[PDB]
Amino acid sequence: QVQLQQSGPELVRPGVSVKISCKGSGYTFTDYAIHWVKQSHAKSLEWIGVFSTYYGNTNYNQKFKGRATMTVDKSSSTAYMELARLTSEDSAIYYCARKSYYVDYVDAMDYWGQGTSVTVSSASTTPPSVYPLAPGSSMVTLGCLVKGYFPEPVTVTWNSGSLSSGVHTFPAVLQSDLYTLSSSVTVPSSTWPSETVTCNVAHPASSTKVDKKIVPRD
């Protein structure tokens, strides 16, 4: 299967550069060019440029002012994009996508990488505090409050991923350089607290994992 695998999320200080990778598999990498696309929010897709993996030729969107440099490692089927002199306006998800023709002569972007989230900030990496939300003594709803961390992302699971149905994990909110998010899980009332429910939180940027059981109030 055609797959483009991108590098992980980056926290970078303003004024530095960041170099992100996109490794192709499941096809002959140098037979297809690579598009790069910026997504600064849900209603914005902006084309950065297209890179010929075979010839090394590039065509850039002038709006990036030459701050983007596209390169390749043909032996490892990997394309790179370096963006220099970063500001907060460069905080975005960056995608690579394969150029192909589904209709003859019409440039399309047909398989996409999973995206690389870049945060441009001077703020300090900070681990989350994880607070269990239990109700007092149908379905019961339990919660987990993940507060005061930076940067994104955190991953929240319930019972190590065994509880997947009935979960709502909400988008984080940024205030004063710290993120807060919450997650709820709804389970049959006959299953808690007679059985255990645990919030599992991982914050890769601070190399932190926290497990908090949701404990009935005493």
Partner: protein, 209 residues
């Protein structure tokens, strides 16, 4: 650049019905009978996915500057942002996106309120959390009351996108106080106004219980 303008910003369509989304280009994206126009679907948390290129539930139409995407019949998993994109000229450009919402029956929110954990109070903070889950339509307002008086400062809200399975929305509202202010009041109330009831849904707790 060629500018692409989509209409509407969002639409709600019932299951099995037809959705039509417009894209207007600032100049022709046609030549030699070929329309250099693609459409993409982006579900939350996922990269865009190519749907249609040039011009069976997804069908592109149009010519010149005037294009549209038709989805028929609409299914629950079609809730997504839809983008048009032109390959007539460099730079490639995208429209601003159109959100497809699945119209379903009204659903009242399930409202749950939580006091601050003992762990948080020990470090001197106090967040009160209210979940308002699995409701439809998406329009909702949450009011926080402390001892009967509305509180505005310290409230932070977050919303989910529409659920790809049951077509509902959920919301989390967190009122954050200091432990000092929190322990000076007794009654904390999350109050939700939603189309589904004439009277607002009230969940509360008393700190001293």
């Amino acid at each position: 650049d060629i500018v692409l303008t989509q209409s509407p910003a969002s639409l709600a369509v019932s299951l099995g019905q037809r959705a039509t989304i417009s894209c207007r280009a600032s100049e022709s994206v046609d030549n030699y009978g070929i329309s250099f126009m693609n459409w993409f679907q982006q579900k939350p948390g996922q990269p865009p996915k190519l749907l249609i290129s040039a011009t069976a539930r997804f069908i592109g139409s149009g010519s010149g500057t005037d294009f549209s995407l038709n989805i028929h019949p609409v299914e629950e998993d079609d809730t997504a942002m839809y983008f048009c994109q032109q390959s007539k000229e460099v730079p490639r450009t995208f429209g601003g996106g159109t959100k497809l919402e699945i119209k379903r029956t009204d659903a009242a929110p399930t409202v749950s309120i939580f006091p601050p954990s003992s762990e948080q109070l020990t470090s001197g903070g106090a967040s009160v959390v209210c979940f308002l889950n699995n409701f439809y339509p998406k329009d909702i307002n949450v009011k926080w009351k402390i001892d009967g008086s509305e509180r505005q400062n310290g409230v932070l809200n977050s919303w989910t996108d529409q659920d790809s399975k049951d077509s509902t929305y959920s919301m989390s509202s967190t009122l954050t106080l200091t432990k000092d202010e929190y322990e000076r009041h007794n009654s904390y109330t999350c109050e939700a106004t939603h189309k589904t009831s004439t009277s607002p849904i009230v969940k509360s707790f008393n700190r001293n219980e």
